[PDB]
mmCIF file with all atom_site columns, C-alpha atoms and ligand atoms in Angstrom:
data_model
loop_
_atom_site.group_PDB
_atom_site.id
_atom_site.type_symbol
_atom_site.label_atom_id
_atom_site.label_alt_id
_atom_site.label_comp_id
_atom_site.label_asym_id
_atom_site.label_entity_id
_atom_site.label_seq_id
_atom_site.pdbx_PDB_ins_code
_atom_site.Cartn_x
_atom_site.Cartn_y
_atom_site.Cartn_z
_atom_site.occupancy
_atom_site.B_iso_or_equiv
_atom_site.pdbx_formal_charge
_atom_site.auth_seq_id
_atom_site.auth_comp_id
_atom_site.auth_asym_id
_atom_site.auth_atom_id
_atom_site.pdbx_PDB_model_num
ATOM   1   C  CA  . UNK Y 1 1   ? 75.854 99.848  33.654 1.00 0.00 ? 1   UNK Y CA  1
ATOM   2   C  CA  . UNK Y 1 2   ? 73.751 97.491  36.065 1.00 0.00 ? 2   UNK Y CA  1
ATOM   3   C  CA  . UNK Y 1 3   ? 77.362 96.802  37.855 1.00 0.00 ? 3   UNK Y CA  1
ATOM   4   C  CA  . UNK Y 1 4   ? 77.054 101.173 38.742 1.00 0.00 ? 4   UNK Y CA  1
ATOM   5   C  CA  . UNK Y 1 5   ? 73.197 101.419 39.831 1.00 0.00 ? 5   UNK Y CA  1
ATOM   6   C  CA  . UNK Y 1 6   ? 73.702 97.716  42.186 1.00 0.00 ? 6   UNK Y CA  1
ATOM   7   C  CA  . UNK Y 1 7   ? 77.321 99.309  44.076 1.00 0.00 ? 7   UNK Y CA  1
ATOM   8   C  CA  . UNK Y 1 8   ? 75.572 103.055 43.978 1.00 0.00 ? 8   UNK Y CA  1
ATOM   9   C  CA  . UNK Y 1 9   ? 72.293 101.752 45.949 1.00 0.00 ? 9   UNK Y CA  1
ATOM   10  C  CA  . UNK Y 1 10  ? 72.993 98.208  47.352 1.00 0.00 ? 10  UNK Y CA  1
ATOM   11  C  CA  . UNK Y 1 11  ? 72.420 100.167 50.556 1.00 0.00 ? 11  UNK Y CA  1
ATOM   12  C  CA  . UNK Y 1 12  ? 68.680 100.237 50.744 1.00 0.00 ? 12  UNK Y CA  1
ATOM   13  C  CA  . UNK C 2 1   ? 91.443 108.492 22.069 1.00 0.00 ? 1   UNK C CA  1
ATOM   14  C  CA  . UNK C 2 2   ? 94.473 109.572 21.990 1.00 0.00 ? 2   UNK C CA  1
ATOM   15  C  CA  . UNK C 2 3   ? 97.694 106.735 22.816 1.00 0.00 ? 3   UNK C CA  1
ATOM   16  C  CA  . UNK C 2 4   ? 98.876 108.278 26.022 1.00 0.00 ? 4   UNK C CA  1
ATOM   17  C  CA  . UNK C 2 5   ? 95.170 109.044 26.962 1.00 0.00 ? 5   UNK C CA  1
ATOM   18  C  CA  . UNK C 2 6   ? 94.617 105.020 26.721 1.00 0.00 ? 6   UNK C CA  1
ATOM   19  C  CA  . UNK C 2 7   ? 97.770 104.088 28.121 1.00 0.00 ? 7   UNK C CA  1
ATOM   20  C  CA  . UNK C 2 8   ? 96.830 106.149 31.138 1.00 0.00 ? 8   UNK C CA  1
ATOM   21  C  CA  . UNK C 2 9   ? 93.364 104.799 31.711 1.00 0.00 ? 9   UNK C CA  1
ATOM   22  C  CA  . UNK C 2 10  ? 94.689 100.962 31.260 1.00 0.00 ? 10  UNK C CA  1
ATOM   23  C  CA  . UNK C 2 11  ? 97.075 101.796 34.157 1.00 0.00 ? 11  UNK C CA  1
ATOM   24  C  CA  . UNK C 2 12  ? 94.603 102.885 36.796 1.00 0.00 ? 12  UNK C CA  1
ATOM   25  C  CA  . UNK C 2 13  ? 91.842 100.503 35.849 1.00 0.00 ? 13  UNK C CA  1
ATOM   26  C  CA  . UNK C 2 14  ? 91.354 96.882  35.338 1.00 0.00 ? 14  UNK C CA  1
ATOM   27  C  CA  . UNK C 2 15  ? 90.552 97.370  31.784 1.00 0.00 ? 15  UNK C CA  1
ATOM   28  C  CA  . UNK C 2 16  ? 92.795 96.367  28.776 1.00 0.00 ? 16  UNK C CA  1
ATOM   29  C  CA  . UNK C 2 17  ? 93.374 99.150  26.182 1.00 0.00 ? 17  UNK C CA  1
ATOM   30  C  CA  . UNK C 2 18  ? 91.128 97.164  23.914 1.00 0.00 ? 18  UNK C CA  1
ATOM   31  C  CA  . UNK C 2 19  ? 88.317 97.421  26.414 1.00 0.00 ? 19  UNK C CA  1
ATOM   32  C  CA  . UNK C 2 20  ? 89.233 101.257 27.538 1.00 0.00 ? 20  UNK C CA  1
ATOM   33  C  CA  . UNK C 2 21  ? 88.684 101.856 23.521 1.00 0.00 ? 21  UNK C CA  1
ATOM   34  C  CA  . UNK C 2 22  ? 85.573 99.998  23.287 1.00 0.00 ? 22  UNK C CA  1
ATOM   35  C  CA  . UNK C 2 23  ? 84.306 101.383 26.577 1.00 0.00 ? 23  UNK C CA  1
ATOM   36  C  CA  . UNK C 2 24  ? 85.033 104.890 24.561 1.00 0.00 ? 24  UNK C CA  1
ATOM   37  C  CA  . UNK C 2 25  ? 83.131 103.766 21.359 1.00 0.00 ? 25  UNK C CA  1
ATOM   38  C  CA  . UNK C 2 26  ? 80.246 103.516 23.434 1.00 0.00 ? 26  UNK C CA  1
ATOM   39  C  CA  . UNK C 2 27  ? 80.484 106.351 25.555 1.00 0.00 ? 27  UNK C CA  1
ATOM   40  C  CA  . UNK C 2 28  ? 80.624 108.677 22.727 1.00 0.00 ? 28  UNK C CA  1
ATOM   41  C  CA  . UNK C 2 29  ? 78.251 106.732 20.980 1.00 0.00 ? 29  UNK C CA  1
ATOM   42  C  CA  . UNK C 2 30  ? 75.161 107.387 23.964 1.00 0.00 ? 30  UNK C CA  1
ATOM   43  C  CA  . UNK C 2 31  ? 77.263 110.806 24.399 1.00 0.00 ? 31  UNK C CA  1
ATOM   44  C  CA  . UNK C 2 32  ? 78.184 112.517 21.498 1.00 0.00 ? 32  UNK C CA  1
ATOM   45  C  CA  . UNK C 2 33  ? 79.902 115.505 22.816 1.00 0.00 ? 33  UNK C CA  1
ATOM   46  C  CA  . UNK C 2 34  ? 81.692 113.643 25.098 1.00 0.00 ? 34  UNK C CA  1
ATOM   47  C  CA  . UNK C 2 35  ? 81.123 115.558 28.680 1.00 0.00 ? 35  UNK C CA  1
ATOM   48  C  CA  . UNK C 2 36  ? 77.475 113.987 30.227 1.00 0.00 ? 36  UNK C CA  1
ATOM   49  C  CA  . UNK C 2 37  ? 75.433 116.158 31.955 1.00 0.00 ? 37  UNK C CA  1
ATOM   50  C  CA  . UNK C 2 38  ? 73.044 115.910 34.846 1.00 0.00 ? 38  UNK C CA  1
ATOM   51  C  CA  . UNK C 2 39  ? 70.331 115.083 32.762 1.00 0.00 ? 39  UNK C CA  1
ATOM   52  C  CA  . UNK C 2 40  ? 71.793 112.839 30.575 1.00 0.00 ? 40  UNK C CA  1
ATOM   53  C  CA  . UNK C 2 41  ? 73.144 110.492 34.096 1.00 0.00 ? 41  UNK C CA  1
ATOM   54  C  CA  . UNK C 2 42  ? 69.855 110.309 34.973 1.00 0.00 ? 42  UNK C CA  1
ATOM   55  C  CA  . UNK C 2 43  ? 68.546 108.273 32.034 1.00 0.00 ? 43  UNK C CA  1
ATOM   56  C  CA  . UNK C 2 44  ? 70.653 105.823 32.758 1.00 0.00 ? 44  UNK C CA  1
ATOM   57  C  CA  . UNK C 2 45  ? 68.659 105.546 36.351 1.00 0.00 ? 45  UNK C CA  1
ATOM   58  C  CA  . UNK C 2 46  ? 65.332 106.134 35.105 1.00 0.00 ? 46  UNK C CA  1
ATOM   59  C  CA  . UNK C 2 47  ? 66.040 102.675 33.210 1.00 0.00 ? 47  UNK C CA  1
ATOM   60  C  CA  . UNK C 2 48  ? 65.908 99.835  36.090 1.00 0.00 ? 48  UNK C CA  1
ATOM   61  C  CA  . UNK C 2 49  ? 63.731 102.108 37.644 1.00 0.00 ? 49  UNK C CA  1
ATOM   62  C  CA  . UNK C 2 50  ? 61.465 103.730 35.534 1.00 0.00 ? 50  UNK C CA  1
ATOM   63  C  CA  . UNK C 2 51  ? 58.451 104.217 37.745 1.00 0.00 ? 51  UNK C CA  1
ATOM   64  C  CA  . UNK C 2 52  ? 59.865 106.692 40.542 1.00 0.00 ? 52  UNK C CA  1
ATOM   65  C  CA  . UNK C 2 53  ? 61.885 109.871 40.558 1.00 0.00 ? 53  UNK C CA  1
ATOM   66  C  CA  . UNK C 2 54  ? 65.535 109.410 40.490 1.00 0.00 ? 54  UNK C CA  1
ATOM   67  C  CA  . UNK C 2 55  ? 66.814 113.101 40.575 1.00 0.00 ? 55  UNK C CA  1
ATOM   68  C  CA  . UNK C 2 56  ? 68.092 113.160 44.158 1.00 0.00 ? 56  UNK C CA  1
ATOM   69  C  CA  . UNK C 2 57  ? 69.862 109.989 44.194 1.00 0.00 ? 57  UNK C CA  1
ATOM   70  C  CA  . UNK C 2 58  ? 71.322 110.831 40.292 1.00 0.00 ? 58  UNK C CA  1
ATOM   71  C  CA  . UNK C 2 59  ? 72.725 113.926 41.954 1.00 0.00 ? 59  UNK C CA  1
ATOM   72  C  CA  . UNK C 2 60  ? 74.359 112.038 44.076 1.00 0.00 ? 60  UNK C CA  1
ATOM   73  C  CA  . UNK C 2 61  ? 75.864 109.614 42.097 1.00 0.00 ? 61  UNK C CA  1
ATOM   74  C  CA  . UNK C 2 62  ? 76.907 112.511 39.445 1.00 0.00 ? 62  UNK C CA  1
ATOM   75  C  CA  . UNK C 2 63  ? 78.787 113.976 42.314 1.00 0.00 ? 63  UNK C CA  1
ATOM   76  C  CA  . UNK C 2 64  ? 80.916 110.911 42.683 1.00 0.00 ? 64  UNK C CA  1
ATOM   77  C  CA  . UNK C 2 65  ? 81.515 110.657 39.431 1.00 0.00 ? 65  UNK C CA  1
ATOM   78  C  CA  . UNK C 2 66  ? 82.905 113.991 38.907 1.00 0.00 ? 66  UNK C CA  1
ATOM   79  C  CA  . UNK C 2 67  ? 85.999 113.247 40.290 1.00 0.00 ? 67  UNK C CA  1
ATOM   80  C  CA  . UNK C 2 68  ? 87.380 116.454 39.596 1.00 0.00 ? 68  UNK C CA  1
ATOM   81  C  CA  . UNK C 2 69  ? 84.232 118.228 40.469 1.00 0.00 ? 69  UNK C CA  1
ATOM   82  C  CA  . UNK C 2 70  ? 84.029 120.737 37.427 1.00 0.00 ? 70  UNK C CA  1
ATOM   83  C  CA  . UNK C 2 71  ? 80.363 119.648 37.230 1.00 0.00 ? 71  UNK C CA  1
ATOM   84  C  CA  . UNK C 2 72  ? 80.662 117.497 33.646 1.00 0.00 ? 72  UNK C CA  1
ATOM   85  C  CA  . UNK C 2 73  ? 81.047 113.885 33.291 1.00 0.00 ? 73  UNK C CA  1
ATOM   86  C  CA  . UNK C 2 74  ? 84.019 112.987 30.569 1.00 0.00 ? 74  UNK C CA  1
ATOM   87  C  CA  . UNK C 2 75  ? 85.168 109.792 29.500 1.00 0.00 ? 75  UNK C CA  1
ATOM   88  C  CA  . UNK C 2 76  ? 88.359 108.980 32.220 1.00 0.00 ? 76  UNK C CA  1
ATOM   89  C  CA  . UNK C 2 77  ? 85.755 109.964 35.291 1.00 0.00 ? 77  UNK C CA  1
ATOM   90  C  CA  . UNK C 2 78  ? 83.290 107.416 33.939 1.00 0.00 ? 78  UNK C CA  1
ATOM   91  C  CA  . UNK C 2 79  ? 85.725 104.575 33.428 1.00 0.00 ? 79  UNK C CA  1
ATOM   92  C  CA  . UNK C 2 80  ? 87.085 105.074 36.550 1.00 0.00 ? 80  UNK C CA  1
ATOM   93  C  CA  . UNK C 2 81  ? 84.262 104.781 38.271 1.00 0.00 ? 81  UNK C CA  1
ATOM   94  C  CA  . UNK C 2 82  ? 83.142 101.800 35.768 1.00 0.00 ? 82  UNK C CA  1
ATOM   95  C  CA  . UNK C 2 83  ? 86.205 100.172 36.451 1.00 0.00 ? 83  UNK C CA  1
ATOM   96  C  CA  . UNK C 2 84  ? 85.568 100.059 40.388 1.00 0.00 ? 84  UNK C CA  1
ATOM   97  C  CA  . UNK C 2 85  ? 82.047 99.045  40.264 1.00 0.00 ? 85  UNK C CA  1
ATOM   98  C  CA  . UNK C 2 86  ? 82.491 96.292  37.484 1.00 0.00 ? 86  UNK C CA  1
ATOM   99  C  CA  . UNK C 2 87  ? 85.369 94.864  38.693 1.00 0.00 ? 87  UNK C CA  1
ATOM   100 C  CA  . UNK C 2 88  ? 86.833 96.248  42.166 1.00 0.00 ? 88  UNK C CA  1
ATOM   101 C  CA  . UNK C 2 89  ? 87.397 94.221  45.039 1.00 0.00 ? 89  UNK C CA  1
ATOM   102 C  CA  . UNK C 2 90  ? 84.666 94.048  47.662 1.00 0.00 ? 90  UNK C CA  1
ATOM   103 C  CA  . UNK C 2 91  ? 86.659 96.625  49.640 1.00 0.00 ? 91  UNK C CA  1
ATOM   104 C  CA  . UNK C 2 92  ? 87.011 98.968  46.542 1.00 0.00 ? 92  UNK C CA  1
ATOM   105 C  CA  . UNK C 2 93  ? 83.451 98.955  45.859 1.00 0.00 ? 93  UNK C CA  1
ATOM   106 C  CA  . UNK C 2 94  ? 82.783 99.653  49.717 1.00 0.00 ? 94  UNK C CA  1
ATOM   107 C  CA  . UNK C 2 95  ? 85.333 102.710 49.910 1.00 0.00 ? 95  UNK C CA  1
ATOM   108 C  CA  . UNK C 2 96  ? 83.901 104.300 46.125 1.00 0.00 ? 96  UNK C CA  1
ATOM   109 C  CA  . UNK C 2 97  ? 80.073 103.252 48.269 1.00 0.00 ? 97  UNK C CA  1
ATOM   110 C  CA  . UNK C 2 98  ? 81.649 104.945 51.272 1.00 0.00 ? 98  UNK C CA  1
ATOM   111 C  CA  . UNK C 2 99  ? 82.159 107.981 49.387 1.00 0.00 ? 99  UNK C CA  1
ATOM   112 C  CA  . UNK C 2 100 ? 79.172 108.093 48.034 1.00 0.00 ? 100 UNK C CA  1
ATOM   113 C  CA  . UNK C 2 101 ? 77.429 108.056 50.947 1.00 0.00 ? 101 UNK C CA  1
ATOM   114 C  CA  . UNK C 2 102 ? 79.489 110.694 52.694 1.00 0.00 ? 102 UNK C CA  1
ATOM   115 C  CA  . UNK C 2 103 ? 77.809 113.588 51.216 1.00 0.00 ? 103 UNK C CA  1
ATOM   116 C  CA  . UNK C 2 104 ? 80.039 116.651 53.551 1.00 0.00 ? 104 UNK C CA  1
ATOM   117 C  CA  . UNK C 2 105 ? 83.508 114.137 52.545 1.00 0.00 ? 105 UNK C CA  1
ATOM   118 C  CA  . UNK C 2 106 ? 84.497 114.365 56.134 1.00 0.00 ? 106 UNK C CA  1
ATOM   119 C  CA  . UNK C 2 107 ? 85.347 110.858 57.850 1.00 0.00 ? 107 UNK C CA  1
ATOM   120 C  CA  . UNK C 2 108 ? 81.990 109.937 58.529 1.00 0.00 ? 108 UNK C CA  1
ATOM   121 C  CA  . UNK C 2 109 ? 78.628 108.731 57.730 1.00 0.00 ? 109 UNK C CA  1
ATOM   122 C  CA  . UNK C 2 110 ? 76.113 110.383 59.955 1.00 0.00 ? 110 UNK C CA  1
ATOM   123 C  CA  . UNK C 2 111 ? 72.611 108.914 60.086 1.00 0.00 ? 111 UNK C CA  1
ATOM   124 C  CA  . UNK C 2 112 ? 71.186 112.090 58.702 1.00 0.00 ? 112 UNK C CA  1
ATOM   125 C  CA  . UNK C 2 113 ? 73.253 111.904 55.856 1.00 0.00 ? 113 UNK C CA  1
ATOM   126 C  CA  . UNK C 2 114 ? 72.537 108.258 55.313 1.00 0.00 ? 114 UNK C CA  1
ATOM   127 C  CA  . UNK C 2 115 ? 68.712 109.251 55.530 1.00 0.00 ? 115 UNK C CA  1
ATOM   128 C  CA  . UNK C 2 116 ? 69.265 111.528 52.496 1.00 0.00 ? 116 UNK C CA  1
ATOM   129 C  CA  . UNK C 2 117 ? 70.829 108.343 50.870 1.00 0.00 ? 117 UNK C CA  1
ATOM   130 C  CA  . UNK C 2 118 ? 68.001 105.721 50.943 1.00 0.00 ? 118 UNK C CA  1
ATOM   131 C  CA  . UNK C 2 119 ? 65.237 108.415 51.052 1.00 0.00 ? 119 UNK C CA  1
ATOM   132 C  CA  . UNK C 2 120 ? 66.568 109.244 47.219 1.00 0.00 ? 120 UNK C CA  1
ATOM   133 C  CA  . UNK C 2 121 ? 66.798 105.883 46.671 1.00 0.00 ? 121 UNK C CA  1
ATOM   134 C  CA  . UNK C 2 122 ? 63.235 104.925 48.103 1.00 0.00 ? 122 UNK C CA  1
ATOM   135 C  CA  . UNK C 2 123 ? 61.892 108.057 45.863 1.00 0.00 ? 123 UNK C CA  1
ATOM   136 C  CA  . UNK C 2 124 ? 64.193 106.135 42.937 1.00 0.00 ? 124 UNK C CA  1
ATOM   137 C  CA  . UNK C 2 125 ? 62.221 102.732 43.423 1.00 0.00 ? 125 UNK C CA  1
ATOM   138 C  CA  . UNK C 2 126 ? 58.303 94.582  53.682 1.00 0.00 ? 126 UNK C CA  1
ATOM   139 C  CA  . UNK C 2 127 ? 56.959 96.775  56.155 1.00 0.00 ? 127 UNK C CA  1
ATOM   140 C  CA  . UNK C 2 128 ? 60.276 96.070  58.532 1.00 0.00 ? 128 UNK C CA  1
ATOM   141 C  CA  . UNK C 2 129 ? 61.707 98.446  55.634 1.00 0.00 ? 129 UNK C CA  1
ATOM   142 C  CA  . UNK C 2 130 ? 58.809 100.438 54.181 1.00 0.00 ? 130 UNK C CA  1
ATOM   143 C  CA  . UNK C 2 131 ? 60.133 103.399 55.314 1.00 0.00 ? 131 UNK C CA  1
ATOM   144 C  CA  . UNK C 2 132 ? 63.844 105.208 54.730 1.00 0.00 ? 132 UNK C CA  1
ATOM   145 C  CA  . UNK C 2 133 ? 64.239 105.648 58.646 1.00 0.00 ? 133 UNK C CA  1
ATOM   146 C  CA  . UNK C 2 134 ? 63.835 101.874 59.459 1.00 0.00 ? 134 UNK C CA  1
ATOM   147 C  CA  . UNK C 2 135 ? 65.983 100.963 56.909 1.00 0.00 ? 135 UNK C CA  1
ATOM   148 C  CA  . UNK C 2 136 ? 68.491 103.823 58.600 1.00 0.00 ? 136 UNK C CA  1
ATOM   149 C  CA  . UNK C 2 137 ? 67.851 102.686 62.160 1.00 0.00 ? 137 UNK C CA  1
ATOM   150 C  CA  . UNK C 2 138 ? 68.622 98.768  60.604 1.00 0.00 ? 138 UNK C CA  1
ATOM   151 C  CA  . UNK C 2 139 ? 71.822 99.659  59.528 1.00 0.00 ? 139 UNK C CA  1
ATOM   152 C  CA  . UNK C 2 140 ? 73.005 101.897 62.323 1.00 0.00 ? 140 UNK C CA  1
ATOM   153 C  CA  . UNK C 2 141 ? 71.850 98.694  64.788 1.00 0.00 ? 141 UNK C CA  1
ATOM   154 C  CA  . UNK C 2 142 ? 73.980 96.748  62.868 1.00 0.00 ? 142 UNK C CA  1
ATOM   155 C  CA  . UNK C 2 143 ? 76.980 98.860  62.052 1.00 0.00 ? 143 UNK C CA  1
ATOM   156 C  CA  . UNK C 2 144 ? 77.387 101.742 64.368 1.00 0.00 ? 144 UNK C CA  1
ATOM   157 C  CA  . UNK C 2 145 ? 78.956 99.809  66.793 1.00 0.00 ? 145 UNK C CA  1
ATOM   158 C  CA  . UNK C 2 146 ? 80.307 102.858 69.348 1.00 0.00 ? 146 UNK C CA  1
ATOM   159 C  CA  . UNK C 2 147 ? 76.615 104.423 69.172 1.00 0.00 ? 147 UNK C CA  1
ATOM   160 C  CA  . UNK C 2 148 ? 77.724 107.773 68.532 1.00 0.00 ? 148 UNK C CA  1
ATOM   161 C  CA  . UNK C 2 149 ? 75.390 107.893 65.383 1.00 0.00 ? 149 UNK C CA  1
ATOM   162 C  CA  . UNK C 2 150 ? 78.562 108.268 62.778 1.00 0.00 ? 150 UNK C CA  1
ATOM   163 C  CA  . UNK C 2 151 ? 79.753 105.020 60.031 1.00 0.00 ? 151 UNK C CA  1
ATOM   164 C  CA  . UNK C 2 152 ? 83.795 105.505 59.843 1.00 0.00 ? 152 UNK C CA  1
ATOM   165 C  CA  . UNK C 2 153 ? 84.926 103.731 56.805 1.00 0.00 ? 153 UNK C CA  1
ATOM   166 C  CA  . UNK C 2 154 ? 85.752 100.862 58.991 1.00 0.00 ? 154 UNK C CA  1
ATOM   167 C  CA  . UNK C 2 155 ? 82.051 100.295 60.595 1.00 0.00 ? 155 UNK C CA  1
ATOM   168 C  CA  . UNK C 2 156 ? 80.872 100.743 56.726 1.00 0.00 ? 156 UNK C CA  1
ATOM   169 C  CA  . UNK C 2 157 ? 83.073 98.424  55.494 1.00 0.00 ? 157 UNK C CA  1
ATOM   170 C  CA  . UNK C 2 158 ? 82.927 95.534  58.219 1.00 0.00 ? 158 UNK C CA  1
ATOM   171 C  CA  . UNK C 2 159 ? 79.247 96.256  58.547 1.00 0.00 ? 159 UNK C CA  1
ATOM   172 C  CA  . UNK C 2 160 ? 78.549 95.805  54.636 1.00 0.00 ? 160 UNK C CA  1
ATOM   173 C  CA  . UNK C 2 161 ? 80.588 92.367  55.428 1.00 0.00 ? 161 UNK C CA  1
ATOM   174 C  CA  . UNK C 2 162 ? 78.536 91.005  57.708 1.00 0.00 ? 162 UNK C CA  1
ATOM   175 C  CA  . UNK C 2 163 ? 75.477 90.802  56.088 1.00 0.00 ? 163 UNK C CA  1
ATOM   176 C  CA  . UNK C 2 164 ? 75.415 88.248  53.669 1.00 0.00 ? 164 UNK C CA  1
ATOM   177 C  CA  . UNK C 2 165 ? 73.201 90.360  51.367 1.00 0.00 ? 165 UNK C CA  1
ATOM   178 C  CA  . UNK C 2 166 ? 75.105 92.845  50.743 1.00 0.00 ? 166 UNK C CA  1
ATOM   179 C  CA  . UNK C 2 167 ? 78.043 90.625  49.342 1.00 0.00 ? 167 UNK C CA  1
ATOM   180 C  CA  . UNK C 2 168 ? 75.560 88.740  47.693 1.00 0.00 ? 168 UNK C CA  1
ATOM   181 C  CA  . UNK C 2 169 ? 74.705 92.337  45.921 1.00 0.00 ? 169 UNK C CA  1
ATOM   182 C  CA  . UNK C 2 170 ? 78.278 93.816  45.739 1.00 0.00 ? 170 UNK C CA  1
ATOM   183 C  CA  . UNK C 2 171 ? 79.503 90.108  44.409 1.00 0.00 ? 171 UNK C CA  1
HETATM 184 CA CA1 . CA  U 3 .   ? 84.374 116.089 35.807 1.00 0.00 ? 1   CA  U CA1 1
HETATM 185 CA CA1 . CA  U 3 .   ? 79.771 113.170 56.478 1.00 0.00 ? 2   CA  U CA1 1
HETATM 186 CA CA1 . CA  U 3 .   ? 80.313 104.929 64.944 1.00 0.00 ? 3   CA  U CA1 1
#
């Protein structure tokens, strides 16, 4: 589930 | 899981049926009833980051996941979605990103919307980016690149590519 939280906030 | 259930799921994601099964075992093992809620999506958050508060940005990220939008989580939305980030190309992961990000699902990304993005992500977790708005005006300097304050899916996508970070995160 690390794969979801890096693509959901790589933004920051 | 039923055989045409699997078949289905192998066909629109890069998982074998082996892996779509085990992927199942432990869904329903972490989520008995099958159909994760709210709360239960944001445990998954409040591990990495267990020292701010991750409700905004879980909301968010539920949303996306609810594919259908009937407000539960089941098993085909979250391998979906698993299947993208895990293993999509880096275009994939941009456009499910995009998506994300585009809270109203019109074309665009407009810098107020992106300010609801990494504010619930700064609440989640260098004083160039110690607050949301810098990190906003940062990436609207780099990718808004007609200055009318709105990210198409192109400027996200070739703006994302650009900076070596971000691949280096997305990899
Ligand atoms: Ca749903
Ligand atoms: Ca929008
Ligand atoms: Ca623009």
């Amino acid at each position: 589930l690390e794969t979801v939280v890096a693509n959901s906030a790589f933004i920051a | 899981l039923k055989p045409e259930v699997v078949e289905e799921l192998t066909r629109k994601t890069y998982f074998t049926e082996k892996e779509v099964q085990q992927w199942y075992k432990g869904f329903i093992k972490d989520c008995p009833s099958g159909q994760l809620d709210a709360a239960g999506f944001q445990k998954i958050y409040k591990q990495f980051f267990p020292f701010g508060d991750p409700t905004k940005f879980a909301t968010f990220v539920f949303n996306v996941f609810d594919e259908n939008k009937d407000g539960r989580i089941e098993f085909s939305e979250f391998i979906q979605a698993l299947s993208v980030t895990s293993r999509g190309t880096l275009d994939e992961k941009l456009r499910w990103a995009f998506k994300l990000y585009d809270l109203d699902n019109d074309g665009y990304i407009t810098r107020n919307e992106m300010l609801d993005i990494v504010d619930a992500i700064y609440q989640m977790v260098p004083e160039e980016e110690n607050t949301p708005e810098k990190r906003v005006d940062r990436i609207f300097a780099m990718m808004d690149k007609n200055a009318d304050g709105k990210l198409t899916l192109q400027e996200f996508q070739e703006g994302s590519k650009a900076d070596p970070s971000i691949v280096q995160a997305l990899s």
